[PDB]
Specification:
Its main location: Golgi. Keywords: Golgi apparatus, Hydrolase, Membrane, Signal-anchor, Transmembrane, Transmembrane helix. GO terms for molecular function: alpha-mannosidase activity; glycoprotein endo-alpha-1,2-mannosidase activity. The chain is α/β, with parallel strands linked by helices. The protein has helices spanning 16-19, 35-38, 68-80, 107-116, 133-147, 177-184, 210-217, 240-249, 282-293, 336-355; strands spanning 5-9, 85-90, 120-125, 156-157, 163-164, 166-169, 200-204, 221-223, 253-255, 257-258, 299-301. The chain binds a molecule of 2 linked components (DMJ-GLC) and magnesium ion. Residues 158, 161 line the site of magnesium ion (MG).
Length: 362
C-alpha cells in the first residue's frame, strides 16, 4: 500500500435513492462565452440514469457519494491500485461547487471508511467564492481542529521532522503572491508557519512563470493536476524535468499529476482540442513513466472519479442508448486502470527506496 501516491477523489455525485435528487450526473452542458458557437452544440441538463454528464459509464452507475457501499467499493478499488492517499475535493461547509450541493458534511464518513481499508485522506482545496489568505486560515484551522485526530487524516511523515498535513490548493495563482505570503511565510501577518495549524501547502502551476509567483507566496510544493499533455506548461510532461530541477533548487515538493486520458465533451462540447484517447493504457503508462523519470517526492493521479473530464481510473463498463455509444476500457476490463496503477505504484514504491541519500551505495 503506497503512501507516496495520491489520487484526486470527488464526493459531489448524488441520486434520488440517497440524496433524493440527481447531482453532477445531471450536469449542464456548459455554454461557450461566444453564443454564436454555443447554439451549434447540445444544451441543458443530462437526464440520467441512461444519459449522464460523462463520456464513460460507471460500474456503480449514477451512484450517490453519500452511499457507504460506494465509498467502500471506491476504497477497495484504490487499495487494489495500491494508492495510500485520496486527495478529497473540498469546499467549506454550507458551500458547494456551482453544479453541486455541499460535501463537507460527508467527510466524517469518508474518513471512517478510509480508515477501514487503512487509507489516508488529504484535502484538495477548490476555489470557493472569496477564497483568500484570511478564510484559508479559518478553513485550515476548522479542517485540523475537525479531522486531525481521525486516524485516516493524512500527514506527510517527514523521515525526521514533524508529521505535517498536506493541502493541495486548486487555482492558487488566483490569489496574488503578496496575499499568500501573509499566511505562508514565517513573518506573515497571519502566518500558520511554526503554529499548531502549520502544513504542506501545494500550489497549482499553469504557465512557466507561476514558478516565481509560487516562491513569493510561501508554498511548500507544486502540482500540475491537468491530464492533457499539451494543455498547460505544467501538464506537459516534457517540462516536468525542469519543474523537478527548479523544485530541488528551492526545496519545493514537485508533485506531478498523471492522467489516463481526457474527454469532457459531455459538458464542454467545444473542448475537443484537449481530448486525449486512452490508447488502451499506453497514454497512462507514458504519463506514469515520465513522472518516474523525474524521481518525484510524491505522484498525484487525475483522477479517481472526475467522470465529466474523462480522467477517472474508477471501474467503468460498456453502455449503449437509443442515441449514445458510451466509451469504455474494452478491449480490456473495467479494472484495467486499477491494474496499470497497482503495477506502476509497486514499481514507484520500490524505485523510491533507492532515491534517499542514506540508502545510496558505493
Ligand atoms: O479538482 C480540481 C478541478 N478538477 C476538474 C473539475 O472537476 C473542476 O471542477 C469544475 O469542473 C467540473 C466539471 O469538470 C464542474 O462540475 C465544477 O462545478 C467545476 O468547478 C475542479 O475544480
Ligand atoms: Mg526535509
Amino acid at each position: 500500500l503506497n503512501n507516496y501516491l495520491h489520487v484526486f477523489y470527488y464526493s459531489w455525485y448524488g441520486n434520488p435513492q440517497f440524496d433524493g435528487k440527481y447531482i453532477h450526473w445531471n450536469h449542464p452542458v456548459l455554454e461557450h462565452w461566444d453564443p454564436r458557437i454555443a447554439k451549434n452544440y447540445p444544451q441543458g441538463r443530462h437526464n440520467p440514469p441512461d444519459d449522464i454528464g460523462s463520456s464513460f459509464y460507471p460500474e456503480l452507475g449514477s451512484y450517490s457519494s453519500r452511499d457507504p457501499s460506494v465509498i467502500e467499493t471506491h476504497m477497495r478499488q484504490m487499495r487494489s491500485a495500491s494508492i495510500g492517499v485520496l486527495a478529497l475535493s473540498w469546499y467549506p461547509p454550507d458551500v458547494n461547487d456551482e453544479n453541486g450541493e455541499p460535501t463537507d458534511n460527508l467527510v466524517p464518513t469518508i474518513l471512517d471508511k478510509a480508515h477501514k481499508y487503512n487509507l489516508k485522506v488529504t484535502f484538495h482545496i477548490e476555489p470557493y467564492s472569496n477564497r483568500d489568505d484570511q478564510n484559508m486560515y479559518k478553513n485550515v484551522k476548522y479542517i485540523i481542529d475537525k479531522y486531525g485526530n481521525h486516524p485516516a487524516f493524512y500527514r506527510y511523515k517527514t523521515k525526521t521532522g514533524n508529521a505535517l498535513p498536506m493541502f493541495y490548493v486548486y487555482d492558487s495563482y488566483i490569489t496574488k503572491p503578496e496575499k499568500w505570503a501573509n499566511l505562508l511565510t514565517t513573518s506573515g501577518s497571519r502566518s500558520i508557519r511554526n503554529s499548531p495549524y502549520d502544513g504542506l501547502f501545494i500550489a497549482l502551476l499553469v504557465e512557466e512563470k507561476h514558478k516565481y509567483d509560487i516562491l513569493q507566496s510561501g508554498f511548500d510544493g507544486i502540482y500540475t493536476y491537468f491530464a492533457t499533455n499539451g494543455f498547460t506548461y505544467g501538464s506537459s510532461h516534457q517540462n516536468w524535468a525542469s519543474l523537478k530541477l527548479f523544485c530541488d533548487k528551492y526545496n519545493l515538493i514537485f508533485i506531478p499529476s498523471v492522467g489516463p486520458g481526457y474527454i469532457d465533451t459531455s459538458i464542454r462540447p467545444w473542448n475537443t482540442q484537449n481530448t486525449r484517447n486512452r490508447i488502451n493504457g499506453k497514454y497512462y503508462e507514458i504519463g506514469l513513466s515520465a513522472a518516474l523519470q523525474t524521481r518525484p517526492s510524491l505522484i498525484s493521479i487525475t483522477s479517481f472519479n472526475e467522470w465529466h473530464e474523462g480522467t477517472q481510473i474508477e471501474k467503468a463498463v460498456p453502455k449503449r442508448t437509443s442515441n449514445t455509444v458510451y466509451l469504455d476500457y474494452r478491449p480490456h476490463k473495467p479494472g484495467l486502470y486499477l491494474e496499470l496503477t497497482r503495477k506502476w505504484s509497486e514499481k514507484y514504491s520500490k524505485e523510491r527506496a533507492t532515491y534517499a541519500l542514506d540508502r545510496q551505495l558505493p
